Structures are given as structure tokens and as C-alpha cells.
Amino acid sequence: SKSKDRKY
Amino acid sequence: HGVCWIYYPDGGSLVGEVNEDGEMTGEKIAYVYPDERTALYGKFIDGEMIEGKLATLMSTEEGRPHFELMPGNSVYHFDKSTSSCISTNALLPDPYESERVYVAESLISSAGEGLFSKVAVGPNTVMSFYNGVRITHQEVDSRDWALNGNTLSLDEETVIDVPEPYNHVSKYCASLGHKANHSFTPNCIFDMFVHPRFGPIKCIRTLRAVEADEELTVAYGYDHSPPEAPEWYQVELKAFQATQQ
Ligand SMILES: Nc1ncnc2c1ncn2[C@@H]1O[C@H](CSCC[C@H](N)C(=O)O)[C@@H](O)[C@H]1O
């Protein structure tokens, strides 16, 4: 994900 | 009649006399920010802000908030972003955020601008809001990192972005969360926030006490084992890794 703060 | 308070998990609330169906509808409804003092007071329909005037909660008597309206004619309404419109009033600042943070040159090397605290606050303090246009993970993930400086994952369906030219405060200053720089030893976190003007977004919340004029930082939390991350971050990730043997 090329975004801040994604949940993995 | 008495009065009802409905709190969000973030500490903000809606307060007022509800109508016959338990709905926050009327002319004397307020949203109260998490400081339990700054308020947007006026006309709401089923909890949606139609005309909220800036006010200060002065006291509560028998549960009923007593407000004073602030001077000026600062008025706000529900104005959720779309995929193409960040705000109806891009230059209208958030009154809560404006008292807590400001933008200046970052103290981090070559990092451009950063977000700074205006005053000393305790842990768990909401400081800033991260509003932006709402686009898909497909669009963001399938485009180059140079376009992804300000992208923030909101949930499994939506990414919030502050695309050029709105990344400059002279063009957009309604919210400032996109101005917080990254740290692997941060003093703030991102947290879900339900905002009366912006709708469901994220905020920047302190995880410890912060001093006046301290730079606010957050861990951007890019995937290190997909590192799917911009170059500056990869460079800084290796350093961080060095620092703890
Ligand atoms: N720890 C860090 N080191 C270097 N650059 C950083 C950084 N944290 C954030 N940045 C910069 O900030 C961008 C994310 S948005 C942060 C606000 C930005 N500094 C601005 O002036 O608008 C990144 O693309 C990168 O340019």
C-alpha cells in the first residue's frame, strides 16, 4: 500500500 | 426536557435536546471537540451540522451545556470531501486545530515543512486533522510514489489524499495533518476521528506529553516486508535499524 497507516 | 450527550470514541460529542425520535435535530445542538470546551453550536439535522457557529462551552448545569458564542462570524457545516473536491472552503481553518498546531520548517533534515505544537499538552491529546480527497487503494497503489507523498489509508476502501496544489498552506489550510513528518520514534499517532465538517477521517493524537514549539511526528507505517516505501524512508529505515543492534 502506497499510503500512510495501512493496517496489515 | 433534559439533554443528551452522544460521544464518539475519539472524545468529541454531540449534545442537545433530542427530538421525538431521539435525534440530534434542532437549532440549539452542538458538536463539542475533545477539549470539552471548543464547540460548534446551532442548527443540526439528525446529527449533521447545517450551521455551527464557533462557541465556547462555559459550564454545564444539570447536564446542560451553557455556551458563549465567539466573536466574528465563523460558521461551519458538514462538507465531506469527494474524489475531486477537498473542501468547499479550503482556506477556512479548523478553529480547534488552529489553537494547537502551526506549520513551519521541519527540524528534520531536508524534510520541507513540519507540524508543530503551539502549546504544551499532555498525552492522548488530539492535535490535528487529516482531511483530504477520497480515492481508491487501486489508484494510489498503481501510481508512482512521487504522487503519494500525502496519501493516508483511511480504511479498506478509501485513501485520503492532499494532492498538489493543496499541499501548500496558501491553497489549503482547512486541516493540517498532512504536514506531520515521519519518525520511527514518534511523539504522535494517527487515530480514527469523526469530524463534524470533514466526516470520518483520521487525526493526529499525542502518545506522550509535548512541549510548546515541539515538532509533531508520526510513524508513517509503510510495509517493510512486502520495503514498499519512498526512498527517503528506506534510507531512514536502515538508520533506525542500525540504532538498536
Ligand atoms: N523523516 C523524514 N525524512 C525526510 N523527509 C520526510 C520525513 N517525513 C516526511 N518527509 C517529507 O514529507 C513528505 C510527506 S508529507 C509531510 C509534510 C511535508 N514535509 C511538507 O512540507 O508538505 C514526504 O514526501 C517527504 O518529502
- CA–CA distance, A2 with B197 (Å, rounded to integer): 27
CA–CA distance, B202 with B41 (Å, rounded to integer): 23
Sequence ranges of the domains in chain B: 1-78, 79-221
Residues linked to residue B53 through DSSP beta bridges, in sequence order: B41, B75
End-to-end CA distance of chain B: 63
Atom of ligand 1 nearest to the CA of B149: 24
Say which amino acid occupies B191. D
> What are residue B80's phi and psi, to 5 degrees?
-65, 140
Angle formed at CA B81 by CA B76 and CA B83, multiple of 5 degrees? 165
Fold annotation for B79-221: Beta-clip-like (2.170.270)
Chain B residues in contact with A2 by the CB 8 A cut-off are 140-141, 143, 145, 148, 151, 228
CA distance B121 to B206: 8
Contact (CB, 8 A) for B220 and B228: no
Q: Distance of CA B185 to CAs B4, B49, B146, Å?
A: 40, 37, 24
Domain B1-78 falls in which CATH fold? Answer: 2.20.110
C-alpha span between B133 and B163 (Å, rounded): 8
Residue A3 Cα to chain centre, angstroms = 5
Q: Nearest 5°: CA angle at B222, between B121 and B242?
A: 85
Dist CA B176 CA B203 (whole Å): 10
Q: Give CA separation, B201 vs B44, B68, B78, B158, B209, in Å.
A: 20, 28, 13, 10, 23
Instruction: Give strand pairing partners of B26.
Output: B44
Residue ranges of B 110-149 with Cβ closer than 8 A to chain A: 137, 140-141, 143, 145, 148
The answer to whether B204 contacts chain A (CB < 8 Å) is no
Contact B102, B124 (CB under 8 A): no
CA B219 from chain centre, in angstroms, equals: 16
The residues facing A4 across adjacent strands are B152
- Rounded to the nearest 5 degrees, what angle is found at the Cα of B100, between the Cα atoms of B110 and B182? 30
Residue B176 CA to residue B128 CA, distance in Å, equals 6
Note the resolution in Å, 1 decimal.
Answer: 1.6
For B89, other C-beta atoms within 10 Å of its C-beta total: 13
Give which of B100, B103, B93 is closest to B119, Cα–Cα.
Answer: B100
Query: How far is residue B230's CA from residue A4's CA, in Å, rounded to a whole number?
Result: 11
User: Per this entry, what is the length of chain A?
Assistant: 8
Do residues B189 and B207 lie in contact, with contact meaning Cβ atoms separated by under 8 Å? yes
Residues 6+ apart with CB under 8 A from B244: none
A8 to chain B, closest Cα gap in Å:
8
